[PDB]
């Protein structure tokens, strides 16, 4: 079909949903849950990329938020393009 460009196409919330549909298992199964995570990778270029979900701190929460909250601060650290505008 046609996705977006990067974290700039999704806001901190719209993007948080993508990670939510991946860590929430609301897709057609784990498979669709991967294309959702890989997209997160090409989005915030983050270091873990698909790890933000497959690499939850040892004792933290893999939830989709703490995952979007960590990235949002990522670009602010690595100076990423950040999400869209809200």
From Swiss-Prot:
Keywords: Bacteriocin immunity, Plasmid. InterPro entries: Colicin_E_sf, Colicin_pyocin. It comes from the Bacteria. This protein is able to protect a cell, which harbors the plasmid ColE9 encoding colicin E9, against colicin E9, it binds specifically to the DNase-type colicin and inhibits its bactericidal activity. This is Colicin-E9 immunity protein. One of its GO terms (cellular component) is protein-containing complex. The keyword Ribonucleoprotein does not apply. One of its GO terms (biological process) is bacteriocin immunity. GO terms for molecular function: protein domain specific binding; toxic substance binding. The keyword Nucleotide-binding does not apply. Belongs to the colicins ColE2/ColE8/ColE9 and pyocins S1/S2 family.
């Amino acid at each position: 079909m046609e996705l977006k460009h990067s974290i700039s196409d999704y806001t901190e919330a719209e993007f948080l949903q993508l990670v939510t549909t991946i860590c929430n298992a609301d897709t057609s199964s784990e498979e669709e849950l991967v294309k959702l995570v890989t997209h997160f990778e090409e989005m915030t270029e983050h270091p873990s990329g698909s790890d933000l979900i497959y690499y939850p701190k040892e004792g933290d929460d893999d939830s989709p938020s703490g995952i979007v909250n960590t990235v949002k601060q990522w670009r602010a650290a690595n100076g990423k393009s950040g999400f869209k505008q809200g």
